[model samples]
Target: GVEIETISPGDGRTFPKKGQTCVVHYTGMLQNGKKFDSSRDRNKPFKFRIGKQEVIKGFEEGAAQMSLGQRAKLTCTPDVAYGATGHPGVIPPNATLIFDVELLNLE
Candidate 1:
């Protein structure tokens, strides 16, 4: 299961919906604590639709539950993430990923 932990709850009155676009900033790390990717490092937010497969499943589902301006931690298992065929050269097989995420906006 994809686990979500709120670090900072948002002020938004509504949660995001499927087909809506989400803008988020995130830092991704491996289970061994290795840094992999970060939107904040690039100064650009990651944008995608809530129910689209544009990103990993865990990420999309976790973002769907968040309100705008919320900061959360998403623990994504391999099945909900890259699965057995993990992203080559970046993620390993059956790797568990950790992400520090912030829902910047939704539309």
Candidate 2:
């Protein structure tokens, strides 16, 4: 469903626990480099619980493996993202998503 490639290692001591709130900054794009969404562009990090349904499955799964301050890229298959149907306007059917992500905080 997803693959995580670390760009820079984090503290290396801990990962966000399930149900804990995780703060992150990210840029979502297609495999071809078309952008979809970005927290960086908003100048605000995004927050979501580790195991909550607040974000896409792949995104949450990738974040679950990250430590605070980690920077990584997550490649999400359609099955774990919007799936075959996808988001009506923001995404397309069977699209693969690439996310440049940073784990900012956990609470």
Candidate 3:
């Protein structure tokens, strides 16, 4: 399960539909708030197609559903996030992940 809090609802008539490509910035962290990865730090937004297998489950579920320019924070369970076997050297096993995401665009 994932819980989302919308910071900005966005200014668009259409939200992301299945297979729509989207660009976004995000900060990924653990349950205790340890910073892991941030698109901002890279000075770029990350791009992926909605419903594509390019991202983690949580990212696909939460972010792919937002409208352009929307900003939100979400707490996602392991199953819909990194899963029980998480990314070693980045995320730990069975970790709960949190993300602060800003939807940049939908194309």
Candidate 4:
């Protein structure tokens, strides 16, 4: 099962809702605590449309409920993450993930 924790909650009438788009800054880590990716290091927030196959399923699940300025940590299993194969040359097969994310904005 996946776990989603809102570290710092946000307030607004607008949420990222299921079919909308959102921007977030995140750092992804493996179970062993090795960092895989970071929008912070890139100096750019990641942007994708929710429920549109624009990102991994687990990511969609986690960020779908966020509001602007919300910070969260989402733990995801292989099935909803990268599955058996994971990302070639990046995430290992059947890897689980821990993502520290902050909902920075929406566009």
Candidate 5:
């Protein structure tokens, strides 16, 4: 069983336990709220293991706190989200990222 709480997602939050897989639906946006990516728009969900390097560090940490059907908005700095180098030509340097995520499951 997992305990869920309502709080701002930040780097200090507990990260997901290693080898645990989490299912989620999410939308990624820029600081100005421009949508960059969305699972909802594609009508699909995402599944990935925690600490597996499947996604960015910020996302892995934030998803660890979520429970089934829980929704959260994560604001992450580039250092923890995409890092300083960023994704060249895509995510800018020192970009602050936003992700609206719905926790679907932990399996």
Candidate 6:
């Protein structure tokens, strides 16, 4: 099967390590390109710790692969994302996520 590499870095390669906190700007959408969330529209960056289970598993992993100021589009499978339970109204079962993520800071 041919898998498209949707995860591409927009800045340098400096993935976040476990326990490290990060601030980022992001937009999440479906594969069909319908947006689900956006920090830019809210005028505030999202902040969380990498590998702390604060966010979705896939989101944490993808953010760990990014460096400060880097941006990337990540295609997250259901298992790696919200999983079968999903988020009820926010995410349905078997859904895939398209995330436009900007790595702002890591500490």
Best by TM-score: 2
lDDT of candidate 4 over 1-95, digit per residue (tens): 65778876677345777666677888988888588888988887877777768788788777766678888888888998676877898987888
Q: What's each prediction's TM-score?
A: 0.90, 0.91, 0.88, 0.86, 0.77, 0.81
Per-residue lDDT over 1-107 for candidate 1, one digit per residue giving the tens place of the 0 to 100 score: 87789876578556888678878898987887688998888887877776657888888888877788888898998897776797888887889899998888758
Enumerate clash totals for all models, in the order shown: 0, 0, 0, 0, 0, 0
Q: lDDT tens string, model 2, 4-68?
A: 79877678667888668878999988997588788988887876676658888888889877788
TM-score of 3: 0.88
Q: On a 0 to 1 TM-score scale, where does candidate 6 land against the true structure?
A: 0.81
**lDDT (Cα) of model 4:** 0.78
Error of 3 at 87 (Å): 0.9
State the lDDT of candidate 3 residue by residue for 35-94, as single tens digits.
888898888787778775778777777875567788889788888756678787887787
Per lDDT, the best of the predicted structures is 2
lDDT score for candidate 6 against the true structure: 0.74
| Residue 67 lDDT, candidate 5, scale 0-100 | 59
C-alpha lDDT of all candidate models, in order = 0.82, 0.83, 0.78, 0.78, 0.71, 0.74
**TM-score, ranked from best to worst:** 2, 1, 3, 4, 6, 5
- Candidate 1 colliding pairs, count: 0
lDDT of 6 by residue, 1-107 (tens): 11223345455656688777788888888986589899999877877786657787777667766687776777888887666788889888888888777787858
Q: Stretches of candidate 5 above 4 Å error?
A: 1-16
Clashing pairs in 6: none
Task: Report the C-alpha displacement of residue 78, candidate 2, in angstroms.
Answer: 0.7
lDDT of model 5, residue 44: 65
Which residue runs does candidate 3 get wrong by more than 4 Å? none
Clashing pairs in 4: none
lDDT of 3: 0.78
lDDT (Cα, tens digit) per residue for candidate 5, span 1-107: 11233344333433457777777788888987577898888776877777767788777777776655667778776787666787877788888888888776655
